[PDB]
Amino acid sequence: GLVPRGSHMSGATEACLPAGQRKSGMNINFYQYSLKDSSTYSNAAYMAYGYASKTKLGSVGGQTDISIDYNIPCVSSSGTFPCPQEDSYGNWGCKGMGACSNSQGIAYWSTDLFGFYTTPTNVTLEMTGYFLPPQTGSYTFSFATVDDSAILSVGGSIAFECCAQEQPPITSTNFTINGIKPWDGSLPDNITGTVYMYAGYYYPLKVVYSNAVSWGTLPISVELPDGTTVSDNFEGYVYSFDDDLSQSNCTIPDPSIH
């Protein structure tokens, strides 16, 4: 055949070719989330778009280094230092610091989330941008763990619409990774999702992350078609573009035949 036949049942992931000035990194938007609310973020509609109905706190652009690793303070005999969760013990102390005098269960203010001053104990954030595959093939995105609730979505009309990165969130709940905190309690370290991508196309990427209490954690990785893994620092892979709703040709519904 002179041409490829295309993915079966138009199953290729939609991608984009935005024509404007590319910027390195993802945009991060921050939204209010209530301390100790362990229910709101267990709903798919909230995690897909509902988060943006709460007050927007602010934003930071140009972020390439995207994993979350937030540790609450331990107010200790020798001063105040962040405590790795695995080093916390008793009621409570932090290994190497002694007993901590402060509550685990209050809000704490910090810039650790992308330099933005907020409460990482209780917040929801939305990361948007475009993933640029350097290689054609299967990419496997993963969260190593999820504390508390998160989704990852890849593709036009799944993450967001082409050339419209800055618009209000779309309603798609067809998540690439569903790390939504279960009602039942529990969940494993499905957690991963696979997308077949064609080199040189821009794939919309959305990550929505929430925490209700204390520690927050979301280690983000992707396994490339060559079997190597990129973790935390996605520089060279993620980009933003200012909205251009007028760019008629921006959406590529089927990169497998374009």
Binding site for Gd ion (CB under 5 A): 65, 67, 69, 84, 112, 147-148, 157, 166, 211, 213, 215, 232, 242
Q: Is 6 in the site for Cl ion (CB under 5 A)?
A: no
For 83, 94, 108, 111, 160, the CA distances from 97, given in Å and listed in that order, are 9, 5, 19, 22, 45
d(CA 5, CA 238) in angstroms, rounded, equals 29
Tell me which of 82, 219, 225, 253 binds Cl ion, using CB under 5 A: 82
Q: Which stretch binds Cl ion (CB under 5 A): 98-106, 116-124, 143-151, 193-201?
A: 98-106
Distance of closest approach, residue 35 Cβ to Cl ion, in angstroms: 17
From Gd ion, Cl ion, none, interface partner of 73 (C-beta below 5 to 8 A by class): Cl ion
Nearer to Cl ion, 20 or 84 (CB): 84
Q: Is 62 in the site for Cl ion (CB under 5 A)?
A: no
Nearer to Cl ion, 76 or 256 (CB): 76
Residues linked to residue 177 through DSSP beta bridges, in sequence order: 152
Q: Which stretch binds Cl ion (CB under 5 A): 27-35, 73-81, 147-155, 173-181?
A: 73-81
For 49, 161, 164, the CA distances from 245, given in Å and listed in that order, are 20, 10, 6
For 55, 89, 153, 232, 236, the CA distances from 14, given in Å and listed in that order, are 31, 47, 12, 25, 21
Nearer to Cl ion, 120 or 156 (CB): 120
**Which tokens hold the place of 141?**
């995105």
Tell me which of 6, 61, 62, 73 binds Cl ion, using CB under 5 A: 73
Residue 35's identity, in one-letter code, is: L
DSSP 45: H
Residues that bind Cl ion (CB under 5 A): 73, 82, 95, 98
